[PDB]
Design a protein around this ligand. Structure first.
Ligand SMILES: CCCCCCCC/C=C\CCCCCCCC(=O)O[C@H](COC(=O)CCCCCCCCCCCCCCC)COP(=O)(O)OC[C@@H](O)CO
Ligand SMILES: CCCCCCCCCCCC(=O)OC[C@H](COP(=O)([O-])O)OC(=O)CCCCCCCCCCC
Ligand SMILES: CC(C)CCC[C@@H](C)[C@H]1CC[C@H]2[C@@H]3CC=C4C[C@@H](O)CC[C@]4(C)[C@H]3CC[C@]12C
Ligand SMILES: CCCCCCCCCCCCCCCC(=O)O
Ligand SMILES: CCCCCCCCCCCCCCCC(=O)O
Ligand SMILES: CCCCCCCCCC
Ligand SMILES: [Cl-]
Lengths: 193, 51, 33
């Protein structure tokens, strides 16, 4: 029975690391890709915008999507809410990358300590991602976001635009991060047996 | 506290603490190369392909 | 261009549910004494 338990724990740890890498990929993709919100048929102008970046159409029956925004230059971000959300998502990405780095500590440190360290760090990454997703809609009342989506938009008011794949993938990342944190906690408390 | 583990017995350790700082050099042998490699992987993917 | 986002959201929700269900399988292997 002991060898079965050891094999199961080792396999679950390896799969947990694999899913941690997958969640890190998800966090990087949602942080980079600007597809959090998208135009609709009723939208006066075509375009989209992420945490910090935003592309808008000129409006001449052609794409001509002028793209502006960059986290590296906070001036270009439309609103303070967008800046805060981008910062929180970056902090979550830094935390999960930190745990992926701390995977190396399994060589030297006790397995329970490393498991609980990534448990807490993944928990903090999940909370940071929640804070970013909660603060990001506050900037929808920005003048450029209102100009693109329309006058109906506002704080926690989607209006004419639609949520695109990046936002839902971020929500999935929140769920996966909380789950990985709990899994790491139970793995750390279980390896002692 | 079903496992009898409270928010100080299950989640956070609060055990002893550090003590094993003498072998802290051994951690940096693998920690520093990994973080820089991880930094390069997403630094170059972010600028070359994703955006 | 068809300015609709359903197949994109469909595949996104599909892969998300797949990863989530894999993690629930991890719980199933874990909590089972
Ligand atoms: C593109 C993305 C790239 C990201 C990749 C980033 C790379 C990150 C750095 C290193 C990863 C490898 C670390 C391998 C560490 C595993 C080492 C290990 O197995 O340790 C044993 C425990 O096993 C255990 O149950 C621990 C099991 C959990 C291990 C979790 C890490 C697995 C990573 C495997 C990679 C999967 C493939 C992913 C490629 C996409 C016991 O030890 P040991 O008695 O001697 O003393 C420990 C102490 O308690 C007493 O001295
Ligand atoms: C130009 C690039 C050259 C890179 C050459 C790397 C060769 C390193 C081989 C590692 C040899 C080894 O395992 O012994 C060193 C220690 C032994 O354990 P302890 O004394 O730290 O307890 O092992 C450890 O405990 C830590 C080993 C760290 C391995 C990771 C090195 C990463 C090197 C890549 C740099 C780019
Ligand atoms: C120390 C280890 C564990 C974590 C390192 C975190 C690294 C990967 C983080 C910290 C700051 C991050 C950068 C912050 C801002 C930007 C601008 C954006 O337009 C593209 C991504 C990019 C370029 C990020 C890439 C990833 C990055 C370099
Ligand atoms: C840079 C290397 C940083 C190493 C971080 C500490 C790892 C864990 C230290 C011991 C944990 C414990 O109290 O059991
Ligand atoms: C060996 C440790 C370092 C790990 C990081 C390796 C990457 C170093 C960066 C080299 C610059 C490569 C430039 C890529 C862009 C290009 O040439 O088109
Ligand atoms: C296919 C897009 C890959 C995005 C980079 C993933 C980074 C993983 C960090 C460990
Ligand atoms: Cl940029």
């Amino acid at each position: 029975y002991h060898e079965h338990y050891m094999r199961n724990s080792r396999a679950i740890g390896v799969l947990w690391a694999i899913f941690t890498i997958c969640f890190a990929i998800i966090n990087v993709v949602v942080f980079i890709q600007p597809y959090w919100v998208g135009d609709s048929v009723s939208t006066p102008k075509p375009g989209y915008f992420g945490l910090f970046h935003y592309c808008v159409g000129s409006g001449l029956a052609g794409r001509e999507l002028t793209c502006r925004g960059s986290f590296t230059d906070f001036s270009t971000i439309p609103s303070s809410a967008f800046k805060a959300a981008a910062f929180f998502v970056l902090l979550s990405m830094v935390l999960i990358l930190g745990c992926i780095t701390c995977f190396s500590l399994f060589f030297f440190c006790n397995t329970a300590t490393v498991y609980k360290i990534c448990a807490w760090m993944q928990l903090l990454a999940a909370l940071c991602l929640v804070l970013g997703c909660m603060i990001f809609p506050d900037g929808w009342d920005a003048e450029t976001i209102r100009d693109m989506c329309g006058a109906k938009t506002g704080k926690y008011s989607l209006g004419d635009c639609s949520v695109r794949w990046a936002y839902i993938l971020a929500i999935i990342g929140i769920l996966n991060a909380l789950i990985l944190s709990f899994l790491a906690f139970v793995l750390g408390n279980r390896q002692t047996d | 506290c079903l496992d009898g583990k409270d928010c100080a017995s299950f989640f956070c350790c609060f055990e002893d603490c550090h003590i094993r700082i003498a072998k802290m050099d051994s951690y940096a042998r693998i920690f520093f190369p990994t973080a820089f490699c991880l930094f390069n992987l997403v630094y170059w993917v972010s600028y070359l392909y994703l955006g | 261009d068809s300015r609709d986002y359903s197949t994109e959201l469909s595949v996104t929700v599909a892969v998300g549910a797949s990863l989530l269900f894999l993690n629930i399988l991890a719980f199933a292997a874990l909590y089972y004494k």
